[PDB]
Amino acid sequence: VGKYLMFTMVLVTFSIVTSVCVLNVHHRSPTTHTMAPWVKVVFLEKLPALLFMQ
Amino acid sequence: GCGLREAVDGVRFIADHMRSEDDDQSVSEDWKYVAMVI
Amino acid sequence: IPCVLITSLAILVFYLPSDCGEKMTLCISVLLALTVFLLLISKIVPPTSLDVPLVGKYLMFTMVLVTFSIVTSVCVLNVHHRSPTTHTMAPWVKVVFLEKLPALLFMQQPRHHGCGLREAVDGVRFIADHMRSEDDDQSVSEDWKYVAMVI
Amino acid sequence: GCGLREAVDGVRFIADHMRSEDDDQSVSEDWKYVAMVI
Amino acid sequence: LTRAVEGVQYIADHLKAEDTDFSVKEDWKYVAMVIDRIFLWMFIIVCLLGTVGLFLPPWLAG
Numbered sequence: 258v259g260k261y262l263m264f265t266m267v268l269v270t271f272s273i274v275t276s277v278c279v280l281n282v283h284h285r286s287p288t289t290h291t292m293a294p295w296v297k298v299v300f301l302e303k304l305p306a307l308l309f310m311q
Numbered sequence: 312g313c314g315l316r317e318a319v320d321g322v323r324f325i326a327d328h329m330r331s332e333d334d335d336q337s338v339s340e341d342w343k344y345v346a347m348v349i
Numbered sequence: 350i351p352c353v354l355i356t357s358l359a360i361l362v363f364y365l366p367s368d369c370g371e372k373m374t375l376c377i378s379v380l381l382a383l384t385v386f387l388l389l390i391s392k393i394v395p396p397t398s399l400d401v402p403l404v405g406k407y408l409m410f411t412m413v414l415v416t417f418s419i420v421t422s423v424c425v426l427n428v429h430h431r432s433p434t435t436h437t438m439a440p441w442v443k444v445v446f447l448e449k450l451p452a453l454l455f456m457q458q459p460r461h462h463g464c465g466l467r468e469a470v471d472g473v474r475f476i477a478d479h480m481r482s483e484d485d486d487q488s489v490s491e492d493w494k495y496v497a498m499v500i
Numbered sequence: 501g502c503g504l505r506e507a508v509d510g511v512r513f514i515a516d517h518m519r520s521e522d523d524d525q526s527v528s529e530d531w532k533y534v535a536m537v538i
Numbered sequence: 539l540t541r542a543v544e545g546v547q548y549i550a551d552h553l554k555a556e557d558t559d560f561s562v563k564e565d566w567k568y569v570a571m572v573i574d575r576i577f578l579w580m581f582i583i584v585c586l587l588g589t590v591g592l593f594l595p596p597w598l599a600g
């Protein structure tokens with residue numbers, strides 16, 4: 258049980274880091290950022306298909 | 312006369328401004344979608 | 350290991366955007382967690398003053414850093430929520446934060462960019478001027494947001 | 501000709517849209533006032 | 539036409555009224571800011587004065 262709790266704690270720390278990064282991506286706009294073409298190609302075409310985002 | 316030209320220019324400016332605003336909003340929605348995918 | 354996990358989060362506050370409205374939650378939580386672990390250790394070790402544990406020294410240093418980060422985050426939030434109707438951007442603020450520092454940090458501000466007839470013309474002119482002024486105000490607000498991002 | 505009628509129709513639609521938005525905002529503010537009173 | 543000029547006049551009047559209301563709201567925001575600033579000054583003074591006049595004696599004794 259202690260091993261499982263420690264494993265879940267590490268995972269939740271990772272999820273906090275990822276949540277901060279996701280929030281940073283969400284609050285972007287042309288006034289302060291420019292979307293690179295590869296970001297478009299990957300995250301708006303390919304990865305959404307593999308996840309059945311549509 | 313002069314007023315007609317001023318009104319025409321104002322309308323054109325309004326249309327261009329709204330077009331630019333729509334483009335910016337579209338880019339913002341693209342960023343939001345990227346975050347959703349991640 | 351709990352202390353290492355908590356310390357790993359002490360820096361995330363400076364990547365969190367000011368619009369998400371959650372910087373204070375993160376930095377305050379980090380500080381309180383660090384303080385709690387320092388107190389637990391203080392309960393475990395003897396209360397002698399011949400030396401300090403290395404882990405206690407490390408926790409103390411991290412706590413000071415996080416207090417500094419909280420003060421900085423308050424300042425950054427204050428800068429972010431500035432508008433032309435409450436503040437005026439000094440020219441040196443422009444010169445430094447919008448031009449020089451971004452280049453040093455590899456950031457690059459993008460910088461996106463029968464009377465009825467006479468009455469109608471006046472109204473259209475007023476509408477156009479009103480939208481122009483709104484556009485200028487929005488641009489200045491964007492500059493304040495960018496300055497906060499650079500800090 | 502047709503352009504004049506089309507433009508008049510567009511302006512009328514814009515005005516009606518703004519009137520509707522104004523009414524909606526007014527009712528929202530009424531709800532806010534009720535909350536303050538409670 | 540009459541409809542066009544009436545609509546343009548209404549739009550202009552609506553924008554003017556919205557601008558006036560926004561001005562009053564910004565005034566309220568500035569008043570809140572001023573109150574915050576004055577209490578910031580007072581609390582900084584009190585904090586420093588207290589932390590120097592109530593943790594000075596401990597150094598005197600130690």
Ligand SMILES: CCCCCCCC
Nearest residue numbers: 325476511514546549
């Ligand atoms: C005829 C000009 C209408 C402009 C309306 C603007 C609404 C934001």
